[PDB]
Amino acid sequence: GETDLQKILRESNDQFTAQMFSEVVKANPGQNVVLSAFSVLPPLGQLALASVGESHDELLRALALPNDNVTKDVFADLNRGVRAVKGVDLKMASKIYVAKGLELNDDFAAVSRDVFGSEVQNVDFVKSVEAAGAINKWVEDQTNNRIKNLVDPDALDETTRSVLVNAIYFKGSWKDKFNKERTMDRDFHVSKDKTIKVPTMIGKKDVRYADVPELDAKMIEMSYEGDQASMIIILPNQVDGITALEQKLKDPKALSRAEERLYNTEVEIYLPKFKIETTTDLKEVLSNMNIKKLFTPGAARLENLLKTKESLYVDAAIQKAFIEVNEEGAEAAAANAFKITTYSFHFVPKVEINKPFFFSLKYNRNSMFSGVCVQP
């Protein structure tokens, strides 16, 4: 049933996300990074349906899925509920481009678009620069021109067989906006000896908070308009605790454990605005996550992708992610002027996100994307 399908998906995204997170963070020490394992699952599921033998089991194994039947049902169900998402602008695009002279299997192309919502199309790689321009134009179109230059013409060859591109963009609208006039330059500790002044938004907000000794950090959860999506922030107690937290976040359950500690309250939040853009070489990351055959000539066995079942493998896989976080939100400052209530003063703790922190977008109990911000 749908309950079980949603569960399988949740579990799969959980372990895949943890795995992908460590890989990316490991290859980008001391740098801002944002990634999404969720946006990658569909194309990988579509690829598992097109493979046979070893490569196919590998993909399924890494996806933590039993078979093709269940794989189709999971993503179908997803695409039976995938429109916009309230309070946030979340765009995720996936597409597989294959050489011009390779006959596409008409059926697999149909299932591709409706089941996995990820398309397949021919492009002439022989004209590399033109092909890159073509691939980059489609992405610009899928992201309101928010994302550009996903694939560099150089990275393409005249002999390229196929390329998988993945793009994800995000900007959200806070359930309760921050007042732009209140934003000011405040200290941010990049390292135990380096401090910079970055624009920091200030506001009193109802959040979900929790002290987490296990992760030696503080967890905060802020919600966006509509109350369907939320931004999770984990702030290590120490200035250099960010790496220690990353190691802990490997276990796909550390996050679940921390969330069990969450409780509702009010705090004065000091949160830096930030925009992170990351280009991830999925070929490098996935290979380190034990998905290699798919990228090995004469080993991929994508015998269901082409009509002639000609041998084909993936030459390059690229994910480009751009995240934007600012004051935008509902209910302007002067909404209800004078709220006449008790003359008293409750204590409102001050939560200052002024050290390298981890963040993650949560939608329908699934992490849409995650990352670390070490330099706003």
Next chain:
Amino acid sequence: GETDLQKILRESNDQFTAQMFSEVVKANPGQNVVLSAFSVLPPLGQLALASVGESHDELLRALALPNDNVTKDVFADLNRGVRAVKGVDLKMASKIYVAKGLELNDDFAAVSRDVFGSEVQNVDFVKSVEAAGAINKWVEDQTNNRIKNLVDPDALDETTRSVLVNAIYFKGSWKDKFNKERTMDRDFHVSKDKTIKVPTMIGKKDVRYADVPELDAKMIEMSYEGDQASMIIILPNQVDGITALEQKLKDPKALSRAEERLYNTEVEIYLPKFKIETTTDLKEVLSNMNIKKLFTPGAARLENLLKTKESLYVDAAIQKAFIEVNEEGAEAAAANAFKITTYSFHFVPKVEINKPFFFSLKYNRNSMFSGVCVQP
């Protein structure tokens, strides 16, 4: 810290609620029932602070609390955040009345009001009927006259030493209202052979849903205005499955397990309107939950309640709960007329709550009250 205090409270309310639920349901077979273990905890905590020896350990044991120090901190923290609660009208009143000729300990009375928010006061029980009228007037005042006749003059004696009264009232405002014009008489299966027609509200709503094989039921979670409180409904698959579910609900974790299955979706809900009013003899229930000394002359040892430390025990303890569930909600039908979107039609499953079901109000991850409705 507050994180740990909230946790202890959650755990305590969880096991106490389960325990109290079975007791009440057991003594009221085939009847509507609503109860609240949460509203009872504070007065029991205040009573644990006033006791010594065995009676004191008993109370603490049942409260699943370590000591007086932690007990005070838990409820203090609670009363450091207890005002109204968004989208719902939730009133909970507690008070201890003691005979007129018993000198109250001035200090314990102070701590009573601020820490536990439960008052203590003298009343002349010698004039039973007048005392009952006095106790019933205060309750009416605490509940906007919503609740009356909590204590019957008969139940009081001229020799009564003390009485604990507990009252809880509730009415909520749905995040998305039901259309009154849409409400109609529909079938409700009271038993496998009896069917009646009760007013049933109909509406398409975004909810949290899950099929729960363990409990052989369907779980639904609807939210109220503000998104802080939610109504949990567990509908057994079978018409007579209600009793089987009650047995399962004894384990304070069955509910937690079921909630892990919840996922967001849209359904067409058919929910009967209903109002349940229950008068529970807390003396009978609590005694069955191993809290006896507190009600035994020469065994209570409430040596901190009176200035002269005179011997005193509780003669009667009464909880009266009144729950109201109807169409009231935010955003009237004609809010945004014509919402111009795709011409298509998604499938929206039909969820018909037409058999004896369990319900529970969840606020800040704590069940404010729970019960069963077998006859709307």
